[PDB]
């Protein structure tokens, strides 16, 4: 405990992600909506917007 701040304990947690290429299993709390077809709408397919 007598050491300086440059030698102090540091806990490190690294979170690593994978950018799609698979069916998504972990996703946020955003509520899904029923589909609509044959209309120009704004879509959100697993974080893919357009």
């Amino acid at each position: 405990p007598t050491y300086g701040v440059g030698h102090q304990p540091y806990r490190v947690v690294v979170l690593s992600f994978e950018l799609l290429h698979a069916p998504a299993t972990v996703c946020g709390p955003k509520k899904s909506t029923n589909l609509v077809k044959n209309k120009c709408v704004n879509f959100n397919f697993n974080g893919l917007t357009g």
Partner: protein
């Protein structure tokens, strides 16, 4: 857990001592790093070994 010098070397494309011998991150790393102080949790007056 790491030391105070070694916080900067947990980064993509960075060499050193702990990054090339213990834990290497890829250059296309897409993720987050969290670091915090642990003075009252991982230390002892006689030496934490």
């Amino acid at each position: 857990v790491i030391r105070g010098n070694e916080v900067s070397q947990i980064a993509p494309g960075q060499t050193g001592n702990i990054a090339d011998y213990n834990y290497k991150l890829p250059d296309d790393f897409t993720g987050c790093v969290i670091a915090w102080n642990s003075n009252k949790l991982d230390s002892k007056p006689s030496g934490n070994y």
